[PDB]
Design a binder for this molecule. Sequence first.
Ligand SMILES: Nc1nc2c(c(=O)[nH]1)N[C@@H](C=O)CN2
Length: 310
Amino acid sequence: FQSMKIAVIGQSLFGQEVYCHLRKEGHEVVGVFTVPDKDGKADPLGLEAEKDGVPVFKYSRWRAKGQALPDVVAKYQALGAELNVLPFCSQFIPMEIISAPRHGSIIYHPSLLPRHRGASAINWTLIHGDKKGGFSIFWADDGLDTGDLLLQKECEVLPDDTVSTLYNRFLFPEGIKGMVQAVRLIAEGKAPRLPQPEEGATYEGIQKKETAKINWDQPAEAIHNWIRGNDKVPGAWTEACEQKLTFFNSTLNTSGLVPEGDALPIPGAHRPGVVTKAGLILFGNDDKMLLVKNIQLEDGKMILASNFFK
Ligand SMILES: Nc1nc2c(c(=O)[nH]1)N[C@@H](C=O)CN2
């Protein structure tokens, strides 16, 4: 064993939990780098670190005129970190920071690397209807999500899984355990390095609300995968009845359903939607059905799709 000085760079409840476990294991978290508020909620990793008197720093920022801000780097170097743990970072972290610690930097990534390198990997897993998923913890190198693996765990992906369900069922609870296990291996001097194969590598970038717009010119199954692969964040959407509607809780189980109800005209779609007591029936460009159970209105109100027209 060895108790280590660790810099934590991340966010969210996931980051908070990794932070708590590292401390429970006897490591010193020398600092936390997280996201700002927005709005006016503070990040829970930052709030937890602040409670404990651990240095907390908020970006981004991160960069200006090519290089890493001299300020952020300064704050980092004072900490004397021996390892960086990245439980949910976002932007490229300059190699002056990534490569500074004796033990380097390890990163949590919610896909089976080399598949779905880049941001929003859980979205892209489901958008493509992958039948298996999981997470990787990997050693940062100078590429984007190309570094050798430390460990990887797989799980089955179910036909109606969403980003949120797959995360809460597996990638969150097992991912936290996995990061903890990784730090233990590093502390013991027993951490593996498993180079990523070239075969099957794919890359996608961040999925912001704007690029979650539905393309209706696809089969029902692909549209279902698009909706669930953006559910709940950032939320797949379209224009209908003169507003922006976001669709959640899709299924391809349309057993016994008939397309009778109140039309929902959707510009660009192969057929109108139909609001039924079961929810919103939608058609793909193959005239096959999918069913959306919930709709978020442009003003943020969540409703049952069956209640759209009251
Ligand atoms: N140097 C480096 N920075 C990273 C990644 C990486 O692979 N290398 N991936 C993301 C980690 O959060 C974003 N930041």
